[PDB]
Design a protein around this ligand. Structure first.
Ligand code: SAH
Ligand code: SAH
Lengths: 318, 318
């Protein structure tokens, strides 16, 4: 039934985490025809239990049965590459720390405090937890960097970044967006603000150990907030945009690169539940973004659609 | 994309648990048209966060939006009844204790020590854990009874239970199967063997405290194993069927009431992975059941299909 399939949906995700995390997936790269007996003795997993996992992976369409050989479906080929966005997302999103948080989602809905499901579980915010668990932070940061690679060409096609001399990436993490921006747009001062215990060093990009909740550094032509605002409540979102305005001089711009809530925007609705559970954030309509900006003393000057589910918002003062 | 949907599948399951566990589902009984603002007050969830959950429930097809009100779709109507098999399954299967176990599935595959992911999580077996958790046990036990209620009719149609004077249900739990069998088949000596802290009393039904891994009581015409064998390794299953043989005298029979593995059989493949994670069990082919029977000193006398994924298997000593 439809109800039975929705109830058991989680098993498909759990099996994919197993397929990637155990190291099974890497044996399926380049559409290789894999023998499960060889796979069992290579990866050191009991043949019977691996053969049973493979039957489930075949059933849900991850693997394809060729008779006496199994292959990774072309649609799911990214799982074979451990550095792929999808593989890295699987390794942090479906890891115990994030997976187990969903257990406390019902409690978080009833508590009527400020604490998300992830905070109830770990007694820490998501980013506070990442500071104490390097491997989880590495997989998160890397997946985000891989995410930036997918949209950078479109961004550079739809928006003129070359008109700005000094560009700061607020919560830019590894600084992947600006590293890739540098390859086309040359001769600019590029900085990235984020919470670093060890400050990363690249030459062509500067890095600042900062806190955008308290203060944002002044003297930049462009301030970028990519997938930052959706991590935060309305008051903290205003606090970041406020701190942006306080550091701004007229002629300077803020660019928001964000997922956009629309009526029946499937991918964004799916994402919105994760943002509640993991970050206590939310996906927002353009109308909501405008009010957050207006409250912070900023005005929307232009909106351009990257995707059917994401946009860039240019902000100024007045 | 197909890969992205498979990765995020778990969120659909988590949202359904939230819908039932928080008590929201009870407001949608009898195709009731629910105001989300009214629902948010009555259940004590923040309106904004409940509205976001309902948007996700609409997307995945659980809820149906009519103008300003929502109803539970006729396909997912079982969620509104807290004693529906689907509601009871949701309340044990997607509960923290079972949900969190799936995190340790990759570790359980690599360790190769015979420990299921559930045992690595809680430090004891599912059934050992049930004896220590009354709410999880109550929901599990009730869901098992609803399982017996749904198929008892088909059981009595395809099998002559009337021919047997003394009937024992090995691992019969609540005794729901024999209680329903009593209503149609009367004047028989009905007994149930399981692990009881306190022995259930229906006076007419005999409830025995025992261990089917140690010994099974003799002097019964029928020994029933319903959803027991699939909980166990091949060796523990042989031990159970050995203890049956040793208790039996010629003319007595063992009836296995069990899910059956067939090539491409979707539902059983799904269940097979849960049996690994929670019980360190498995779903088996008829040929696998025959080897276990042969190893135990027993023979298959008859096989009768309940439905597509379920069968009853008569065993005899030979
Ligand atoms: N108070 C704070 N000050 C600075 N950076 C912060 C912060 N809280 C969170 N961050 C950083 O904000 C980022 C949010 S994730 C998004 C990163 C990047 N814009 C991208 O497109 O992937 C993370 O790097 C996180 O560590
Ligand atoms: N060692 C053991 N000795 C006796 N009963 C056991 C056991 N290990 C597990 N069981 C019981 O085996 C049952 C398996 S679940 C199936 C319950 C019932 N036959 C039904 O289908 O509705 C549980 O009730 C559990 O308590």
């Amino acid at each position: 039934s439809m109800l039975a399939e929705l109830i058991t949906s989680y098993r498909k995700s759990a099996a994919i985490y197993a397929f990637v995390d155990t190291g099974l997936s890497i044996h399926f790269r380049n559409g290789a025809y894999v023998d499960i007996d060889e796979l069992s003795r290579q990866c050191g997993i009991d043949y019977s239990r691996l053969d049973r996992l493979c039957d489930f992976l075949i059933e849900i369409g991850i693997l394809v049965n060729h008779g006496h050989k199994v292959t990774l479906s072309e649609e799911c080929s990214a799982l074979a590459d451990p550095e792929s966005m999808e593989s890295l997302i699987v390794k942090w999103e479906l890891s115990p720390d994030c997976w187990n948080a969903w257990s406390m989602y019902p409690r978080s809905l009833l508590e009527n405090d400020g604490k998300p499901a992830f905070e109830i579980t770990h007694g820490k915010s998501f980013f506070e937890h990442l500071a104490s668990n390097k491997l989880l932070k590495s997989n998160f940061d890397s997946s985000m960097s891989k995410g930036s690679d997918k949209i950078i060409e479109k961004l550079l096609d739809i928006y003129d970044f070359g008109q700005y001399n000094r560009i700061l990436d607020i919560g830019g993490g590894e600084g992947s967006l600006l590293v890739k921006m540098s390859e086309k747009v040359k001769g600019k001062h590029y900085a990235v603000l984020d919470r670093y215990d060890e400050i990363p060093v690249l030459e062509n990009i500067d890095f600042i150990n900062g806190d955008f909740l308290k203060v944002i550094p002044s003297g930049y032509d462009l301030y970028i907030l990519k997938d930052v605002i959706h991590d935060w409540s309305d008051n903290n979102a205003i606090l970041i945009l406020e701190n942006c305005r306080k550091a701004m001089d007229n002629g300077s711009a803020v660019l928001l690169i964000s997922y956009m809530k629309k009526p029946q925007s499937k991918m964004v609705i799916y994402l919105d539940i994760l943002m509640d559970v993991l970050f206590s954030g939310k996906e927002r309509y353009l109308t909501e973004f405008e009010r957050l900006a207006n409250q912070a003393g900023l005005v929307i000057q232009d909106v351009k659609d990257i995707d059917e589910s994401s946009s860039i918002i240019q902000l100024g003062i007045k």
